[PDB]
Design a binder for this molecule. Sequence first.
Ligand code: HEM
Ligand SMILES: [Xe]
Ligand SMILES: [Xe]
Ligand SMILES: [Xe]
Ligand SMILES: [Xe]
Length: 154
Amino acid sequence: MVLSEGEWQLVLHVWAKVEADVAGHGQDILIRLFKSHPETLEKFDRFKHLKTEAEMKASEDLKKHGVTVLTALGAILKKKGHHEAELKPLAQSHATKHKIPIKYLEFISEAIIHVLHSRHPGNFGADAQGAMNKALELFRKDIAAKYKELGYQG
Ligand code: HEM
Ligand SMILES: [Xe]
Ligand SMILES: [Xe]
Ligand SMILES: [Xe]
Ligand SMILES: [Xe]
């Protein structure tokens, strides 16, 4: 699939607002993911112990990881489809070391969309959400193709 420049503009415009507070958005997204789909938390031996939303919000370690996640995603989105080089090490670590199924990438995509919708209603109307969804679908499609080459695809 290919996004139009108009679609990338909608994605990068709302992303510019996300970058004003990377740590805060990273925290919101990861917490939303763990509350909505508790099973995903089991993949993080680093955070499995967190029992409540309050503990999650208080974790400095969780906030640091959210920044790492958003920084990696932001670098990919800014390539506007030319992300082959950036995707390789991510696909390798998530397929071979972390063992993250495609299903879980769908869950975090949903979490990202929910958070942007709540925090940026004026910059995340239907058209902007559709463009972000297309961008995340492209990301997942390419990661899935990589998983298959690496011998995981699941
Ligand atoms: C938007 C998608 C995601 C991005 C861009 C992303 C990015 C990253 C980055 C940059 C790292 C550190 C380097 C590495 O290990 O590759 C990482 C580590 C990791 N990721 Fe992801 N990730 C994503 C989704 C997920 C999901 C959905 C899960 C599981 C539910 C997951 C589980 C992990 C785990 C277990 C680690 C290691 C954490 C640690 O112990 O330090 N990731 N991820
Ligand atoms: Xe995140
Ligand atoms: Xe990933
Ligand atoms: Xe994603
Ligand atoms: Xe992408």
